[PDB]
Amino acid sequence: PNFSGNWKIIRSENFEELLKVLGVNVMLRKIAVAAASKPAVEIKQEGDTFYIKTSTTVRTTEINFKVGEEFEEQTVDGRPCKSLVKWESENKMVCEQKLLKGEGPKTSWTMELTNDGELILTMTADDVVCTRVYVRE
Numbered sequence: 001p002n003f004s005g006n007w008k009i010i011r012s013e014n015f016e017e018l019l020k021v022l023g024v025n026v027m028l029r030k031i032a033v034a035a036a037s038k039p040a041v042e043i044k045q046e047g048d049t050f051y052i053k054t055s056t057t058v059r060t061t062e063i064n065f066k067v068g069e070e071f072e073e074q075t076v077d078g079r080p081c082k083s084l085v086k087w088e089s090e091n092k093m094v095c096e097q098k099l100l101k102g103e104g105p106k107t108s109w110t111m112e113l114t115n116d117g118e119l120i121l122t123m124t125a126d127d128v129v130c131t132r133v134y135v136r137e
Contacts, residue, residue, distance in 0.1 A: 001091035003050070003111070007041040007119050011133035018123060018130035021105060022077040035059065041119070041134055050085075067093065072100065075107050076123060088112075 035057045044051040048067035083097040092112035105126040119134035
């Protein structure tokens with residue numbers, strides 16, 4: 001199971017709602033969801049080592065990690081957090097994250113490939129799930 005390649009989103013569910021669970025700048029959502037409606041994921045995998053760039057218009061973030069080694073990043077609302085990636089199976093990984101300094105809803109993100117060659121990326125902030133589906137472009 002190799003996740004590397006250029007991915008294009010073809011499906012998306014419960015995203016603006018997930019945002020409310022965090023209480024994001026309501027008004028910007030239209031403008032932001034308009035850019036975030038087309039987030040292009042670029043992945044480079046080399047064993048347990050991953051390079052993931054998530055770009056949209058006006059925004060570009062990159063993360064680098066190795067399965068099992070903690071690293072810091074940011075929650076969907078911009079809060080810094082320490083994260084740890086574990087393998088569920090050979091094609092599904094799960095990231096558990098915890099806020100560095102502060103308090104808020106418990107978050108995480110899973111990532112998996114299907115036999116069909118689709119990248120399913122879900123994000124669950126507490127009990128609210130947000131699913132995005134990608135396809136190798």
